[PDB]
Amino acid sequence: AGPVTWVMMIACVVVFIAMQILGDQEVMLWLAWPFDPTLKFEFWRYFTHALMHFSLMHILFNLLWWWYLGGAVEKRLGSGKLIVITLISALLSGYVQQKFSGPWFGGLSGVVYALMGYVWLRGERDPQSGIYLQRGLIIFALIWIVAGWFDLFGMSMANGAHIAGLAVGLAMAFVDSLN
């Protein structure tokens, strides 16, 4: 697994530890989407919400997916593409999330949804570029999407972040296939 895939896992872990030690609210205060006008110039916050997980299922599921899909993208398409997929989804999912619901949310799953939509749609519309979501895994992705939508998980779900994330990934596979 490439460096981008790896450092993102590291960072999510460091952040998760920090959340267990200092508490969730303490870490949110530093990392959440700006929740006050004074924080508007704190540029990291438009991204760092992606780094926070609020339970062991949260971090574990998001990182397993990240590891696989993220790692696919990085090896077949390169580190640069994964960085750009990540920044775009993170920023866009974050924006839609806070519009609907407020600045209080976190998780790498806006981004994981981007990677699902991206890998699949690009494997459908662009097979030779080496990227596909195997039939079988598409089903488990599809169920993942569904669980989110219908609030199965037992978690409170960042609704905006999840769709925005998926759209972004589809939009990007679209744009990328047509070449």
Binding site: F54, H58, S93, M155, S156, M157, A158, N159, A161
Partner: peptide, 4 residues
């Protein structure tokens, strides 16, 4: 908090 909303998860994601």
């Amino acid at each position: 908090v909303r998860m994601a």
